[PDB]
Write a protein that binds this ligand. Sequence first.
Ligand SMILES: [Cl-]
Ligand SMILES: [Cl-]
Ligand SMILES: [Cl-]
Ligand SMILES: [Cl-]
Length: 124
Amino acid sequence: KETAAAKFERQHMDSSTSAASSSNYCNQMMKSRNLTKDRCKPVNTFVHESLADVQAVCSQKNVACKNGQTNCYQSYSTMSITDCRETGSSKYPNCAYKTTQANKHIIVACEGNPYVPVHFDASV
Ligand SMILES: [Cl-]
Ligand SMILES: [Cl-]
Ligand SMILES: [Cl-]
Ligand SMILES: [Cl-]
C-alpha cells in the first residue's frame, strides 16, 4: 500500500516545471501520475514548487480544514499551481481535463513524524 505522504507526492507535486506549459498539461499529468487508471480522478491540483517548500507549509499557518479537522496549514506565500478538472466530454476512459494555472496560497493537511503533507485541502 502507498504511504499517505507518498500518495500526496504522486498526486500533488510537480517541481519539474514552473507552471503548466499548455492546455494539455492536465491530460498528460493526470495520466502519467496514474490518476486515470481505473477511473478519471475528477479534480486534482499539482503544485509547481520544490518538495521542500511544500513540506515546509506544515510549519506555517495552522488553519481549519474544510472537513473540520485542525491539522491543515496555509502557505505564507503564494505558489505556482495547476488545477486539473474533468470537462463535460470526459468519460472513462478517454478522460479529458481543463488546465487552469494560478498563483495562490495552498492549504494542506499534515500528519506523521516527519510531519508532512498527506492531503491537499484547497488553494486561496
Ligand atoms: Cl509509493
Ligand atoms: Cl513515504
Ligand atoms: Cl486536489
Ligand atoms: Cl525542485
